[PDB]
Amino acid sequence: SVVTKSIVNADAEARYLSPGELDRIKNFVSTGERRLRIAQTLTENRERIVKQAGDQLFQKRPDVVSPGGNAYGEEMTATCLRDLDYYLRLVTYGIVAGDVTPIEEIGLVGVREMYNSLGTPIPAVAEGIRAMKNVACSLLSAEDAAEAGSYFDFVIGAMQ
Amino acid sequence: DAIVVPSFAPVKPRLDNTKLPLLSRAIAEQEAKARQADPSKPRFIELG
């Protein structure tokens, strides 16, 4: 969160929270309700967003869903979409927190280890998260879509 | 027999406001921002 990140950096200095840091907390706390609304819309349409992302990701990269790929068969395809759903849940968490530290902790640390062990192609996962970004942004208002794009962008940037 | 203070005459100000510096800045801003794109709205390319 904005609060914990500011507190941690202030802790490094051991100084009590600087006036600018406290003002940052004031800004974040004041805009929290709008953040809640963004997360609410994404979770309310969580099913539609995730399934559409699956359609678009498979269409960009048919090879992942082709025979001999990780997402072959209904069960394997469903697990791929479950991963997309997990990352959408993480994105809503990150929106509410106002920082990307929750997304990083839950899902992005060591993702390359996990996914190549599973055999899944990480760049294809990145394309899927990009599809999630586009779908969610289309649902969101222009002001809301700008911030949600940043939270999705950390995920795709880590994936690379 | 004359009245030194006949009555106090109203005056029409010479300097018209909404040309004064502060309102002029604000009038420019409201007009220009209205013509520009609108935050927090789904349809913005439709509007003329």
Side-chain angles (χ1 to χ4, degrees), chain A residues 1-14 16-20 22-46 49-98 100-142 144-160, chain B:
Chain A
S1 70
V2 179
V3 184
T4 188
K5 267 221 178 297
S6 302
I7 289 170
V8 162
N9 200 13
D11 189 12
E13 257 65 19
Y16 295 80
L17 265 296
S18 47
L22 291 171
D23 290 3
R24 190 85 267 263
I25 308 308
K26 175 186 168 76
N27 308 341
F28 162 75
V29 163
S30 60
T31 197
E33 216 290 326
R34 180 184 55 78
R35 301 180 184 277
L36 295 169
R37 201 188 307 166
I38 302 181
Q40 185 58 69
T41 64
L42 293 198
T43 186
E44 191 268 298
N45 235 344
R46 67 190 202 89
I49 301 166
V50 172
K51 225 303 182 183
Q52 188 66 39
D55 304 333
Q56 296 180 0
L57 155 67
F58 294 148
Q59 204 201 275
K60 213 293 171 189
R61 289 260 294 178
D63 64 317
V64 312
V65 73
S66 293
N70 264 245
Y72 195 59
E74 178 192 338
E75 298 292 331
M76 290 292 136
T77 291
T79 63
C80 190
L81 293 206
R82 179 191 56 79
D83 297 344
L84 292 189
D85 188 287
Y86 273 19
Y87 280 116
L88 181 62
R89 207 185 79 262
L90 301 203
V91 161
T92 66
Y93 294 165
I95 292 165
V96 164
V100 201
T101 192
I103 314 181
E104 184 189 15
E105 289 175 354
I106 305 166
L108 291 168
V109 173
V111 72
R112 303 190 187 179
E113 309 292 338
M114 175 199 71
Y115 263 142
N116 257 350
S117 172
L118 297 161
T120 280
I122 301 119
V125 186
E127 294 286 334
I129 306 155
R130 190 166 297 175
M132 297 215 69
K133 164 174 66 67
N134 295 2
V135 175
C137 287
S138 81
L139 291 181
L140 287 166
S141 312
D144 296 355
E147 304 210 343
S150 300
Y151 295 107
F152 280 110
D153 268 21
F154 188 88
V155 190
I156 67 183
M159 294 276 161
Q160 272 172 345
Chain B
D1 301 334
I3 306 101
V4 156
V5 188
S7 293
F8 291 92
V11 194
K12 298 88 177 297
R14 54 224 67 173
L15 183 41
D16 170 49
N17 57 340
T18 73
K19 283 294 186 178
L20 303 189
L22 286 202
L23 299 97
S24 199
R25 276 261 310 175
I27 285 182
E29 179 273 341
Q30 76 154 349
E31 219 294 316
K33 186 179 180 58
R35 292 213 318 260
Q36 287 304 100
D38 42 319
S40 70
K41 196 68 181 296
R43 313 278 162 268
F44 40 98
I45 27 263
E46 176 178 317
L47 312 180

